[PDB]
Amino acid sequence: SRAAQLLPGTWQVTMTNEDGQTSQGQWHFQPRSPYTLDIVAQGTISDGRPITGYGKATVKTDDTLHANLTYPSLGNIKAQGQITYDSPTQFTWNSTTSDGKKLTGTLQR
Numbered sequence: 650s651r652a653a654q655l656l657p658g659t660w661q662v663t664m665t666n667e668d669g670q671t672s673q674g675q676w677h678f679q680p681r682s683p684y685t686l687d688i689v690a691q692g693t694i695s696d697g698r699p700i701t702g703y704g705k706a707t708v709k710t711d712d713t714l715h716a717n718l719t720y721p722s723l724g725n726i727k728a729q730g731q732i733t734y735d736s737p738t739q740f741t742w743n744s745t746t747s748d749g750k751k752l753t754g755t756l757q758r
C-alpha cells in the first residue's frame with residue numbers, strides 16, 4: 650500500500666467539527682506491520698480544549714486506511730474514519746466520533 654508507505658512520521662493535522670470549531674495539531678505515525686500503523690495525536694481545539702490521543706490505522710486499499718482513535722483529554726471519546734491519499738504530502742480525514750458527530754480534516758507535510 651502506497652498510502653501506508655508514505656504515512657510514517659509527522660503530519661500537521663487541521664480539523665473542523667460539527668459544532669463549528671477547528672483544531673490544529675499533529676499526528677505521529679509508527680508502522681507496526683505491512684498493514685498497520687500506530688498514531689499519537691496532539692493539538693488544541695479552538696475552544697481551548699487540549700487534544701491528547703492515540704489509535705491505529707489499518708490498510709484497506711492502496712490509497713485508503715481505516716483509523717480508530719481514542720482521546721483521553723476529551724472525556725475518552727473515540728473517532729473512526731478513513732485516511733485517504735491525496736498526494737505524497739497530503740491526506741484527507743473523514744470520520745465520525747463516538748458522539749455521532751462528523752469530524753473531517755487534512756494531514757499535511
Ligand SMILES: CC1=N/C(=C\c2cc(F)c(O)c(F)c2)C(=O)N1C
Binds near residue numbers: 676692720752
Ligand atoms: C488537530 C487535531 N484534532 C484532533 C481531534 C479532534 C478534533 C476536534 F475538533 C474534535 O471535536 C474531536 F472530537 C477530535 C486530533 O487528533 N488532532 C491532531
